[PDB]
RNA sequence: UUUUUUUUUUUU
RNA sequence: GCGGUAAUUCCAGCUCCAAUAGCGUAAUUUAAGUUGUUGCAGUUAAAAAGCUCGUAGUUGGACUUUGGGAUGUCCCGUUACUUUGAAGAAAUUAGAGUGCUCAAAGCAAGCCUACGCUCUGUAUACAUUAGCAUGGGAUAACAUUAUAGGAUUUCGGUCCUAUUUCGGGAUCGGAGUAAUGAUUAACAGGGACAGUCGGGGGCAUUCGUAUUUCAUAGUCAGAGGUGAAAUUCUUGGAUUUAUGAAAGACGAACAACUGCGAAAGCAUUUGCCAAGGAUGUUUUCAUUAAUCAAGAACGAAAGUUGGGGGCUCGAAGACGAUCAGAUACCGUCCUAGUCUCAACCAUAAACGAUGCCGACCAGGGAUCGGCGGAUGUUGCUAGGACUCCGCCGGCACCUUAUGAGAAAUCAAAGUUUUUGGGUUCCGGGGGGAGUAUGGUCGCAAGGCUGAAACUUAAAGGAAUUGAC
RNA sequence: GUAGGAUAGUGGCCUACCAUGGUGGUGACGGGUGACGGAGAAUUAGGGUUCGAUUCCGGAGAGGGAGCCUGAGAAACGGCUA
């Protein structure tokens, strides 16, 4: 059954971006998905996305810039301390110059650089570049 | 239609109608309610387009519709008007 | 596919533990069978020469490989040991005392010699290498 | 190696198909796999048609026809030359010969 | 997909986006509750009551006019059945299958279907025990299942 | 659609 | 891999190479992404249980306070997890200083020769899990919710206690206050309903030709079988012809790159009995779910025990041929069996050699079931048949690579070093071996579980060229 | 669990009476270990794998068991008793 809605959303965006589509559909919606999309959009990796209300979980349509190489979920959501971020980035990101790991900390959902800045740990949600 | 030739947020009405009721951008049924009148009786009754029961007019005790696989089949004498 | 549950550490550990036994190297060193083998987990063993034996070489070679039947002193087991180098069988006699080492492949036959896993290192307390090079002399008694 | 996508038969969405007996050797063969040919020919061979017609006992009469369904095993079908070994590309053609 | 088969059908209802009653509908919420209670007294399950209302009285959704579901209204008036309707129907099917098997020992397909139906019954009963819709002592027994219905 | 068994060891 | 009379490979001489006061030989690490959590495999290389159910275990859809004004600050139940701190023997490890002549070390030591000085130095870091304290409240887990016996203000009756009428309790009622208290209904799941559909299952019940045998009648010399024959049957009439009867199997043609079923499997009619998918639904419940150790249901053929049947074919067996032999292939006759009932057996190349659930992912034409719309005919009785356009679900097919792959190939065997959706099983070079032993099931045959000693450099997959 | 005895003292540590409890696929119980545990050692992308008799810490033993005197301290063994 559906276990990770975030995984389905990210996989749909990844497949659509690889195919070259200008838009993709995400169903169902979630606030974790919305926070992930906002983190991605903050860094210019996606365009505007629109939430559609259907009196249910909802739907999202995302504009694709063509800058997304790969976005993925990490499962299970491992515990990441402030000292494990370096190792996780080395494992997951292509380079130290670009790429982000999205974490969920008690301060909110944010990328790993902001987590280092605020010295907050949490759980790994995914990655994109 | 090619994916970049259409807008996922503004699909043409024809495509939305052609799509499965659950696969539309917002789910919407294809059923409706209708006002059915007997041939001779002025009484007017509301009937579901996909009625699963044999609706009978109280006055004359006449069957208005017959359940089927999909839409209910009205009796030949009776006529209906889309209520909505 | 693999199990990935965050609470599934026990299953992963147990599965690896069970699957380790399919590994031949792991099973050899964890079944405790090395103690029932002729050397009983030792690099060397002393023994008494019972008889000189010639072993035909395996195809496609054709030769008579000179070996000795040795009884190990510490457990009484009987093995076949190769005698290397030219004419070195002449330094071996029945009832001689020989030091035996492995053949280098950890309990497996080497080269064209079938079913031989040991070699003679010393005879009567003198290394076969010294005897071959005439550095030492085999004790008379 | 697998050489046919259908595995040499015509079974899809099905567990078991009952067999036929080869019309030549009597061997059991699944019906979906047996090479089946339907033969419709005149009872009287073309050579003897004229002689039989000249001896007709009625003013008019249409000669009957013989109907035979032949079901071969693979071995008999190849040996009798009902089918022949084809090249790797040519054996993917399913249309009957013209 | 289906719980006890390989079916992958997606046929279902498509609730309209509009949650308010249609303008042409004039019945009031207390009236709808009264008809629901009368139907329940006549011996109709909530599904049957909803079907009748939709097909005859023009009530597409009872929640739209009353603001609550049919079973909630029935419970508020002390008319909800002792055992839930779906579990009741599952038990009825199991009883029918066992009655058929009593005379057909060679019908192994019926035995397979009885196993499936009783698995469904037990899972649903466990769920209803968790939510306190059944007493903790409740237990489905094939021998005396016919008594329950 | 009668019948048709067999070819020492290594190496080129 | 060298050595079979021209040996860079053995025994030697010469020369040369590597390390060097060292070097050779005989448990364990790396290399090993060949144990794979990071991070391997399971179509054909070794590999997914025959099929389904199912408890432990693991996993589990969405939804509840956001924003601006300003300026860390003001306005509108229990845990996991993370931050910080304490504390946490030395030695060892990392590391600061220091010319034991250098170095491995050690914890020394330096200026100047002052009857001395540098308060000389002898730092610092690290430290799984678990415990202690602290800040955070995103993501998660457990518990709770509506028969109000709920929250709160006041007051009336009842039951007991203390500091100098009173305070503190512990119960029973009246009134008031309030927005009085229930997220949605997942292209999750279950259940109800409607018209259907199907070679799904069971019981009973019609039919069909053919085969064998028998009965009646006709005719006369061969019939059968083979590559060729013979065994065999035949004037006591074979074979062949017509009619009829009995018995037991088997359900042709229709019949398909079609259907149903969890699989095994399921094809003559009609009735009865329960069961089922898909479709349709503005019906119902509201997370009830996915997958699964243990444990269960079913499970071709053959086989077992005992009845009934016993047409056909036919293991075993017996003959006739062929042959060097022929315990065979071919022919002739046949026991068990083949069919059914009751009870066992539980294995098949039980195959798609390919677990289940969920998401995304190119195009096209066919086809089965259901449904929506349009349209024109029918030797028919609004319907059915046909035509066209669509939606859902299913068995498949064709083209293609922007994908994968060792390829063969695969539109799932794709979305994988840019490696992580959930979950079960299961392989680790080839043999020994599915063997020994123990256990367990079975009447038996055997099933399930299942080693080791020892042996060995390949075995093996796909594809290419040649030869045959 | 109650009441006692014993102990330097808590405690089924032992006695009398009473109750039927306690652990277990989150693997009890049983078996193997060529098993003393730790600080640590080898190898080092990271994760890991293998080792730890031996000089520091803790435990145990003095040929195998058992009992005990002296003493603040021992079930001591370069103490005694069988
Ligand atoms: K040889
Ligand atoms: K050779
Ligand atoms: K195949
Ligand atoms: K075929
Ligand atoms: K299922
Ligand atoms: K449906
Ligand atoms: K040779
Ligand atoms: K010579
Ligand atoms: K020579
Ligand atoms: K050499
Ligand atoms: K028979
Ligand atoms: K026979
Ligand atoms: K011959
Ligand atoms: K069997
Ligand atoms: K197959
Ligand atoms: K279709
Ligand atoms: K005590
Ligand atoms: K006590
Ligand atoms: K110890
Ligand atoms: K003293
Ligand atoms: Mg081949
Ligand atoms: Mg089959
Ligand atoms: Mg399931
Ligand atoms: Mg689905
Ligand atoms: Mg021969
Ligand atoms: Mg020479
Ligand atoms: Mg030389
Ligand atoms: Mg491998
Ligand atoms: Mg094979
Ligand atoms: Mg294989
Ligand atoms: Mg298999
Ligand atoms: Mg099992
Ligand atoms: Mg969630
Ligand atoms: Mg739903
Ligand atoms: Mg006849
Ligand atoms: Mg059909
Ligand atoms: Mg027929
Ligand atoms: Mg019998
Ligand atoms: Mg016969
Ligand atoms: Mg049988
Ligand atoms: Mg098997
Ligand atoms: Mg159709
Ligand atoms: Mg192996
Ligand atoms: Mg006491
Ligand atoms: Mg130690
Ligand atoms: Mg020891
Ligand atoms: Mg020592
Ligand atoms: Mg010590
Ligand atoms: Mg002691
Ligand atoms: Mg001693
Ligand atoms: Mg003693
Ligand atoms: Mg002592
Ligand atoms: Mg001593
Ligand atoms: Mg002492
Ligand atoms: Zn044939």
Numbering used by the authors:
A (entry chain e): 2 to 130
B (entry chain K): 2 to 85
C (entry chain T): 2 to 142
D (entry chain J): 2 to 99
E (entry chain W): 2 to 150
Copy the relevant paper text.
In the decoding centre, a tight network of several ribosomal components facilitates the correct matching of mRNA codon and aminoacyl-tRNA anticodon during translation. The first nucleotide of the anticodon (position 34 of the aminoacyl-tRNA) is stabilized by the tight stacking of nucleotides C1277 and A1432 of the 18S rRNA and Arg146 of the uS3 protein. The interaction between the tRNA anticodon stem–loop (36–37) and the 18S rRNA 530 loop (C568 and C569) is additionally promoted by the amino terminus of eS30 via Lys3 and His5, as has been proposed for the human pre-translocation complex. Similar to a human ribosome, the carboxy-terminal residue Arg147 of protein uS9 directly interacts with the anticodon—namely, with phosphates of nucleotides 33 and 35. Moreover, in the tobacco ribosome structure, the C terminus of uS19 is nicely resolved and reveals interactions with the P/E tRNA anticodon arm, apparently supporting accommodation and translocation during the elongation cycle. In the plant 80S structure, three putative K+ ions are found close to the decoding centre, stabilizing interactions between the mRNA, the uS12 protein and elements of the 18S rRNA, thus probably supporting the correct positioning of the codon in the ribosome. Interestingly, the uS12 sequence difference between T. thermophilus and tobacco leads to a change in a local charge distribution, which might explain the presence of the third metal ion in the decoding centre of the 80S ribosome. For example, nucleotide m1acp3Ψ1194 interacts with the anticodon stem–loop of the P-site-bound tRNA. Another modified nucleotide, Cm1645, directly contacts the mRNA codon at the +3 position. Using polysomes as the starting material for sample preparation allowed us to obtain the tobacco 80S structure in a different physiological and conformational state from the recently reported 80S ribosome from tomato. Both structures come from species of the Solanaceae family and are in general similar, although it was possible to resolve two proteins (eS12 and eS31) localized in the head of the 40S subunit of the tobacco ribosome that are missing in the tomato structure.
The macromolecular machines that execute protein biosynthesis, the ribosomes, consist of rRNA and ribosomal proteins (RPs). In plants, protein synthesis is realized by eukaryotic 80S ribosomes in the cytosol and 70S-type ribosomes of prokaryotic origin in chloroplasts and mitochondria. To elucidate the structural basis of cytosolic translation in plants, we report the cryo-electron microscopy (cryo-EM) structure of actively translating cytosolic 80S ribosomes in a rotated conformation (rotated-2 state) from the model plant tobacco (Nicotiana tabacum) at a global resolution of 2.2 Å. This resolution allowed us not only to build the correct atomic coordinates for rRNA and RPs in the 80S ribosome but also to describe ribosome solvation and metal ion positions, as well as chemical modifications of rRNA residues.
